[PDB]
């Protein structure tokens, strides 16, 4: 129940604001900046500010704070969802999120803000649907918004019906400094880039553990996703009844389903780090990386970030495989590897000096994070079975999909 959603800037200047209820004076935005400065300087800064009886909820964008003031006990979650939808719409319409576009497309920006929500109640959220009525370069509103299918525009015609899927894997590993992995969760991501003619209704079928058990085929390798969240086009009733994944695919790239379950397998990369840090004399980086993934798989663009000392200087690198570059901006050593075949073992020996003068304050021990990304690898073993592409006119579809395994929250606690 936000009173007015506004777009601010890094210097406190409001790029654009649009009142929806009018219950709060527009001059309250001036006090938002001092309140944020005080909260940050005292550690009490939070996304939802509070200026007396009015709460100033704001989120940090690429360059501006999307502040949405409110007065009553409105749905904070609803405000957050509206802000996320607005951010997605801005990203779709504007390729850049900075002050260069905020002051460059205000003519269409005002119309989009007016059309998106009214009186604090969001009404339009389809970026593709909104692009059919609001353009920066007007006809009646499309019937798709009025119709039940607001995620599949009818009448779309394509020369070919090719859909590019994406089996994106997220390997999140939380290895403590004691050597044990605490948080080992893998989040699936079934994203498809559908480009076909008409309004096809995808009939998804994969190797799910629940589906195999229900059909009686619970004996092969089936993925038991702890959390499975369908997209907007996905029908909740069909999945609730018999795990029937039937929905109308959108026009373009969209996230249909996203698996989320814990992992009980060994890490794909085993990283052993050593710290022979002399007392203000030198430091040793006994970093050893063991690839626990299958030898048939290669981790392309592997970047094992090793945090070096804050005041460290004059580093010397004695490694075996992979380029090592010390970036002073990040204050860490990135064990950069172009391609890392599975089962590889790379040994590195860092050595640098330290200033004689001791530091006045501690710097902390940031965790070691790697940026491995091995495509065409399915650690979870979930295999897609079929995708029921049905059209009223009738056409032969040629769906495509690629499985990509990358490194997510794969942080390693430092000693």
């Amino acid at each position: 129940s936000a009173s007015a959603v506004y777009v601010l800037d890094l210097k406190g200047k409001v790029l654009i604001c649009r009142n929806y209820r009018g219950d709060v004076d527009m001059s309250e935005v001036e006090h938002f900046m001092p309140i944020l400065m005080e909260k940050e300087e005292e550690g009490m800064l939070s996304p939802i500010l509070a200026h007396g009886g009015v709460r100033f909820m704001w989120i940090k964008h690429n360059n501006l704070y999307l502040v949405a003031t409110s007065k009553k006990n409105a749905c904070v979650s609803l405000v957050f969802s509206f802000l996320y939808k607005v951010v997605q719409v801005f990203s779709e319409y504007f390729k850049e999120l900075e002050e260069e576009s905020i002051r460059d497309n205000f003519v269409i920006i005002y119309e989009l803000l007016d059309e998106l929500m009214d009186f604090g109640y969001p009404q339009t959220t389809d970026s593709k649907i909104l692009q059919e009525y609001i353009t920066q370069e007007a006809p009646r509103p499309p019937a798709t918004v009025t119709n039940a299918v607001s995620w599949r525009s009818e009448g779309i015609k394509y020369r070919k019906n090719e859909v590019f899927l994406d089996v994106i894997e997220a390997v999140n590993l939380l290895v403590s400094a004691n050597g044990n992995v605490l948080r080992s969760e893998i989040v699936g991501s079934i994203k498809m880039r559908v480009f076909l003619s008409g309004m096809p209704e995808l009939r998804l079928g994969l190797n799910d553990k629940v589906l195999f058990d229900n059909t009686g085929r619970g004996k092969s390798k089936s993925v038991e996703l702890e959390d499975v969240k369908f997209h907007q086009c996905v029908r909740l009733s069909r999945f609730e009844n018999d795990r029937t994944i039937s929905f109308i695919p959108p026009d373009g790239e969209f996230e249909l389903m996203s698996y989320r379950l814990n992992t009980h397998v060994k890490p794909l990369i085993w990283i052993e780090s050593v710290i022979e840090k002399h007392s203000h004399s030198r430091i040793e980086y006994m970093v050893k990386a063991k690839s626990q993934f299958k030898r048939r798989s290669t981790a392309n663009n592997v970047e094992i970030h090793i945090p070096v000392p804050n005041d460290a200087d004059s580093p010397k690198f004695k490694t075996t495989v992979g380029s090592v570059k010390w970036v002073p901006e990040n204050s860490e050593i990135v064990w950069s590897v172009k391609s890392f075949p599975g089962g590889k073992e790379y040994l590195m020996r860092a050595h640098f000096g330290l200033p004689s003068v001791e530091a006045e304050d501690k710097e902390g021990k940031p965790p070691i994070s790697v940026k491995f990304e091995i495509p065409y690898f399915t650690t979870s073993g979930i295999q897609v079975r079929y995708l029921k592409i049905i059209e009223k006119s009738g056409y032969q579809a040629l769906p495509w999909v690629r499985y990509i395994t990358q490194n997510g929250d794969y942080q390693l606690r430092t000693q």
């Binding site: 994406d166 990304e373 495509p375 592409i389 999909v401």
Partner: peptide, 18 residues
Amino acid sequence: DRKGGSYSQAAGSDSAQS
């Protein structure tokens, strides 16, 4: 080619389940 795993053809449904 393309980084992240080459695109592969997909079926229409579980032919083994009728």
